[PDB]
RNA sequence: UAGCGGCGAGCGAACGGGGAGCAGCCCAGAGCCUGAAUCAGUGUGUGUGUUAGUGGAAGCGUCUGGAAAGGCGCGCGAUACAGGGUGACAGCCCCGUACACAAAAAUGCACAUGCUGUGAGCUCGAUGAGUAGGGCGGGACACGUGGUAUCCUGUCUGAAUAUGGGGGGACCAUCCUCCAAGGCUAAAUACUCCUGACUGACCGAUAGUGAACCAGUACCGUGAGGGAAAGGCGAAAAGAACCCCGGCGAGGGGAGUGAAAAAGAACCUGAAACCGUGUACGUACAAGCAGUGGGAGCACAGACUGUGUGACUGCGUACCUUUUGUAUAAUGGGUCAGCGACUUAUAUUCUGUAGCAAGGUUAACCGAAUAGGGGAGCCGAAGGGAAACCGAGUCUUAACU
RNA sequence: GCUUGACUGCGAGCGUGACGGCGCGAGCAGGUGCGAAAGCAGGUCAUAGUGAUCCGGUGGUUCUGAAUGGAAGGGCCAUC
């Protein structure tokens, strides 16, 4: 039958123009007053996922 | 031509892996699995996403956003798709006929997307301004 | 599709077993063990045309020496006076007139120890 | 294109495309492979270990008595076991796209002509629903393994037809790659061959 | 997919679209006109099945052979060359097959018709109360109580009643849509203990059913229950009269049958393990994976080389598995024969290959059926953003060098 | 002594990690502090002083809002 989606998976990525899956940085959730402007910044906008865990990313989602 | 000179393209048929048939073959005894591990036993190997146990990216990541089901509902021409409905009016009605955008499909835009020649009359639709720009060359018309 | 291996599988121990004719026992009349003497007399066969060449080199070297003795010179030195005399033949064929043509030989040797010195 | 009638010895245009085209010789083998896989019916079925019908009592306690450790008497490697990946009822029939299945035809029709294995004429009718009649006309022709192609339905030439071996009639709609390649000659009638150059296209 | 979900593992719609099939009615009720349509049972007539059946074409000569259906000649039938038998492979020898016919009787399904019950249409009405909601506890909805709509109810309550009420995913207003608390209803859907016909890139006696055979038997178990093994003479018994050895044996040798009995019922073929008889060569001073390289002699077969044996001699500690590492005194195997393990379906990705190409392809289904229709859909030709939205750009930011 | 640069948006380019991430960073825009000015300041001589995701809480919001207008809920930003 179908395969399935890894659901948690489809809700933290999403696939870009030439393949790729953008991300949202951890470690911007809770606490924030002890951890740095500038790192605070850097970590707030999306990123593409890297080269080694691409594959597990495509396996957990076979449609996108 | 006889049902038995006809022959297949070179490199349409491969051959299908037999394992654990003997040595010769190449995929021997263990069948191309190594030795004794999980990924050798019958049924094994590890689900999507298992990392030995480490806390899976798919779960070490924040999710994000939301889904929009406006989006769902929204749809993008182009300019071939001008010239592809029949007539010289691009209604919703016309470009569903047209087989062009979905059944369910409220809105629309026509984006600078191939060419439009013909001139096409776009009524009730939101316009880039390249492809505005690009109908109003071709000679067409656009209204609200 | 049901594949019955009877003929296929006797003809393949058939043949293997005649390989393994004249062998003591189950070495020749026991799939399983005919099987493993006959490996092991191919690998015997490799290494013994390998030690072929060396045996009769070792043959070979041992006539020549008895023979260049008889005509009071050592086998190395014999060696040594053919080679400076520019001699080419060769030791399979020198042990072969030794044994059978004494005359030749003994010239042979001749000219080694005039070449020597 | 142009055939030659066999009775009138008169021209008959066709289609290059249909009746002209190179012979893709690949395309047609997997048409015609496809078609036998469709025709095979594939009703069969064994017996897993499951289904053989049996208790599932373990035949003998995991130690003590020395022999090897069994647990099934329905175990594949038992006699009278099932079999270890046993048969179900299966459908072979592959998909042929309508362009591919279409150019096989073309193929096999240009070959045809080529090879003067189609041969045209104006009509084949046969007078009475007779054997007699019809093998007597297919020798006059000089036939002998043959498909007749016509046009319109005919009673008389199917009733005839019925028992010769080597010839089958057809209607133009019903022609098929193997058989085309199978019959030693093909006998078109004009209807027919117009007929079929419409469907083609 | 949207959603649900220790937001884990997993579960997983609906709206809308294409098809198959499409049938709508009745009571809460009385006045009128009233046997009025429909439905059910029951007789009768007709048609068409079903349960026995009838007819059903056309070939001889010759050779081989135990036997012709085979070879080689010359003919004939075919709306019949499906299939099965007959001394080897038969269109024409037999049974059938195509095709054309057949029922005293019983009965299925159609109409036609008679009788019985059944009640149509109009006007006026009436419009399902411990119910809908609610509180508490559970359950069902993709929906795990969550912001949770909707459905069911064990418990305690409890309306309005068309000037009315339900729903539209917390909730309110507006708008739209429908009328709960009473019923009936064919089709398309599911299945095969069983009956008939036909088919198979299904098996062919360790296979296929457990069971080709007197099998759910023998046997095992107190019992529920478990549960085998075991097919083949020959074309035809022509199954061996008679004689002989032997215990009025068993078994055998003649005889006879037969194409063949080394086809004799312990019966087609008749492998291997295993056990013998005969012949050649070797072997009783010689130490080990038993072979291999060299190699004398001896025997045989042909005119020296083939074959068989192998004195003596160099080298040489099985195989598998598992291991850093095994001759290992680590595992497994007494041997032989048969069987015994990377499959199948559906999704997805990449590679090859074929088709068409900014297009490609159809799914159910329909179908004088692998044709043709069917483009509902799906993938692609546009991305960016969480989204609104913008768009060859877009997001970030007040703005970006 | 005077102050709040213990700024906000970004950031060429590097370092270090299998990755999650972590680190250094000139310069640009806005707005400030000290200095006469050149200048310096995006915490502390540097290297420890820490905890992913989920699920919630609080505030803001030119996003969304299941007939429509709201609202709930969701998103985004800050934070616990
Ligand atoms: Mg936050
Ligand atoms: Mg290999
Ligand atoms: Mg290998
Ligand atoms: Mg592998
Ligand atoms: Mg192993
Ligand atoms: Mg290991
Ligand atoms: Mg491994
Ligand atoms: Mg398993
Ligand atoms: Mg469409
Ligand atoms: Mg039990
Ligand atoms: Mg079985
Ligand atoms: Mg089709
Ligand atoms: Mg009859
Ligand atoms: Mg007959
Ligand atoms: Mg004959
Ligand atoms: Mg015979
Ligand atoms: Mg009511
Ligand atoms: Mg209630
Ligand atoms: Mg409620
Ligand atoms: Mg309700
Ligand atoms: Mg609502
Ligand atoms: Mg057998
Ligand atoms: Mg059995
Ligand atoms: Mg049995
Ligand atoms: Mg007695
Ligand atoms: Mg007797
Ligand atoms: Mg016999
Ligand atoms: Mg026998
Ligand atoms: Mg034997
Ligand atoms: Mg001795
Ligand atoms: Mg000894
Ligand atoms: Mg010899
Ligand atoms: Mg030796
Ligand atoms: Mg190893
Ligand atoms: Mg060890
Ligand atoms: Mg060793
Ligand atoms: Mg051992
Ligand atoms: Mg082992
Ligand atoms: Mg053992
Ligand atoms: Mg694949
Ligand atoms: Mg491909
Ligand atoms: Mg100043
Ligand atoms: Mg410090
Ligand atoms: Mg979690
Ligand atoms: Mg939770
Ligand atoms: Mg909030
Ligand atoms: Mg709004
Ligand atoms: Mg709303
Ligand atoms: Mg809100």
Redesign the interface.
Same mark, same amino acid.
């Given at each position: 039958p179908k395969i399935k989606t %890894?659901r948690? *998976?489809a +809700? =933290?990525? +999403?696939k870009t123009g030439k393949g790729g899956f953008k $991300? +949202? $940085? *951890?470690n @911007? =959730?809770h606490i924030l007053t002890k951890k740095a402007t500038k790192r605070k910044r850097h970590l707030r906008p999306k990123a593409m %996922?890297s080269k080694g865990?691409l594959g @597990? %990313?495509i396996?957990?989602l076979p449609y996108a | 031509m006889r049902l038995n000179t006809l022959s297949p393209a070179e490199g349409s048929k491969k051959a299908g892996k037999r394992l654990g048939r003997g040595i010769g073959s190449g995929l021997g005894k263990t069948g191309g699995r190594g030795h004794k591990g999980q990924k050798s036993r019958s049924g094994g190997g590890v689900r999507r996403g298992f990392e030995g146990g480490q806390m899976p990216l798919y779960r070490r990541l924040p999710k994000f956003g939301f889904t929009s089901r406006k989006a769902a509902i929204t749809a993008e021409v182009r300019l071939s798709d001008l010239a592809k409905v029949e007539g010289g009016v691009v209604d919703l009605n016309t470009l569903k006929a047209a087989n062009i955008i979905g059944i369910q499909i409220e809105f629309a835009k026509v984006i600078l997307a191939g060419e439009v020649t013909t001139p096409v009359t776009v009524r009730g639709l939101r316009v880039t301004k390249g492809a505005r720009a690009a109908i109003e060359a071709a000679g067409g018309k656009i209204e609200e | 599709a049901r594949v019955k291996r009877g003929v296929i599988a006797r003809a393949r121990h058939k043949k293997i077993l005649k390989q393994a004719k004249g062998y003591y026992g189950a070495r020749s009349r026991v799939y399983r063990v005919a099987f493993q003497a006959v490996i092991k007399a191919g690998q015997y066969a490799y290494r013994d045309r390998r030690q072929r060449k060396r045996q009769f080199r070792q043959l070979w070297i041992a006539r020549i020496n008895a023979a260049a003795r008889q005509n009071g010179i050592s086998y190395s030195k014999f060696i040594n006076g053919l080679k400076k005399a520019s001699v080419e033949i060769d030791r399979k064929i020198l042990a072969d007139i030794a044994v059978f043509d004494k005359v030749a030989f003994t010239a042979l040797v001749e000219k080694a120890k005039a070449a020597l010195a | 294109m142009e055939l030659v009638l066999k009775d009138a010895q008169s021209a008959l245009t066709v289609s290059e495309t249909t009746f002209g085209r190179d012979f893709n010789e690949a395309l047609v083998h997997q048409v015609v492979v496809a078609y036998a896989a469709g025709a095979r019916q594939g009703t069969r079925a064994q017996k897993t270990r499951a289904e053989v019908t049996g208790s599932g009592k373990k035949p003998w306690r995991q130690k003590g008595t020395g022999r090897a450790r069994s647990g099934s008497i329905k175990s594949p490697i038992w006699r009278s076991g099932g079999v270890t990946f046993a048969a179900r009822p299966q459908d072979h029939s592959q998909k042929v796209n309508k362009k591919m299945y279409r150019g096989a035809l073309k193929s096999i029709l240009s070959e045809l002509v080529r090879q003067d294995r189609l041969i045209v004429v104006e009509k084949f009718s046969v007078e009475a629903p007779k054997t007699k009649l019809l093998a007597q006309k297919l020798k006059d022709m000089a036939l002998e393994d043959v498909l007749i192609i016509t046009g319109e339905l005919d009673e008389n030439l199917f009733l005839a037809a019925r028992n010769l071996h080597k010839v089958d009639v057809r209607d133009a709609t019903g022609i098929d790659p193997v058989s085309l390649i199978a019959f030693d000659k093909v006998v078109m009638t004009a209807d027919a061959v117009k007929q079929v150059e419409e469907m083609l296209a």
């Open positions: %890894v948690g *998976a +809700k =933290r990525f +999403k $991300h +949202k $940085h *951890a @911007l =959730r %996922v865990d @597990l %990313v396996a957990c | - | - | -």
